[PDB]
Design a protein around this ligand. Structure first.
Ligand SMILES: [Cl-]
Ligand SMILES: [Cl-]
Ligand SMILES: [Cl-]
Lengths: 119, 119
C-alpha cells in the first residue's frame, strides 16, 4: 500500500486533481513542463505506476482519472494507518495519542465532524 | 520518531512490543535470529542506541522495555498521513472525511480521545 507520494507522482496527481476531465499523457506532460523537462515516456511510466497503485484509472486516445480526490486520498491514508493497530485497545490508545499530536483547529475539526456525524 | 526507525531498530522494537515482560539482550538476539544472522554485540549496541533515544529503558538480569507502545507507532503513521495534505484547507477537509470514513466504534473511540484531550 502507498503511504506517501513521490514528488513526480504528486506533480502528476496535482494536475489531475485540477481538471474535471480525464487527461492524456500529452496533457499531463504539458502541465509538468511548467517546472520540469521530462521525457514523454517518463510521464507515461509514472501514470502507469500510479495506476498500479490504484491512484488513477486509465480510461479508453488514453486518458487518466484520479481514483481519489486530494482530500479523500489523505483521509484514506489515515484509515490505512489506523488499520495497522493490532486490536480495539491499541486503536483506542492510538487515537488518544493522535489527537494529542494534531493542532486545536484540527482537534476541533474532528469534534465538529463527529457532532455532525451523529446529530 | 517511531515511524522513522532504521530497519534493525524497528525489528528490535517489534520484538519488544510482542512481549509483555522486558526482554534480555539474549532474548532480543534469539528473536531476530530467525530472519538475520547478527552478532550479539550488534543487538546489544542497537538496544543501547535505542535507550539513548529514549525508546527503550534498561531495567535492572539486564532487560529492556519499550518506552512507547506500538499504539504510538500507529498514532505516528496517522500523523504522517495527515502530513501528506498540501495545506491547512486540505488538512481540515481530510479530517472531516476521516471521521466520515471510520466505523462507529472508532468514532466513539475518537470521541473518547478528544474528551481526554479536553480534560
Ligand atoms: Cl525524464
Ligand atoms: Cl498496535
Ligand atoms: Cl552483525
Amino acid at each position: 500500500k502507498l503511504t506517501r507520494l513521490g514528488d513526480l507522482e504528486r506533480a502528476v496527481m496535482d494536475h489531475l486533481w485540477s481538471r474535471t476531465e480525464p487527461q492524456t499523457v500529452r496533457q499531463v506532460h504539458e502541465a509538468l513542463s511548467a517546472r520540469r523537462d521530462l521525457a514523454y515516456t517518463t510521464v507515461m511510466a509514472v501514470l502507469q505506476r500510479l495506476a498500479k497503485k490504484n491512484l488513477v484509472l486509465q480510461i479508453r486516445a488514453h486518458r487518466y482519472a484520479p481514483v481519489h480526490g486530494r482530500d479523500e486520498l489523505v483521509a484514506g491514508l489515515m484509515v490505512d494507518a489506523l488499520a495497522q493497530a493490532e486490536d480495539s485497545g491499541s486503536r483506542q490508545a492510538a487515537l488518544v495519542h493522535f489527537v494529542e499530536r494534531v493542532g486545536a483547529d484540527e482537534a476541533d475539526a474532528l469534534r465538529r465532524a463527529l457532532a455532525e456525524l451523529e446529530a
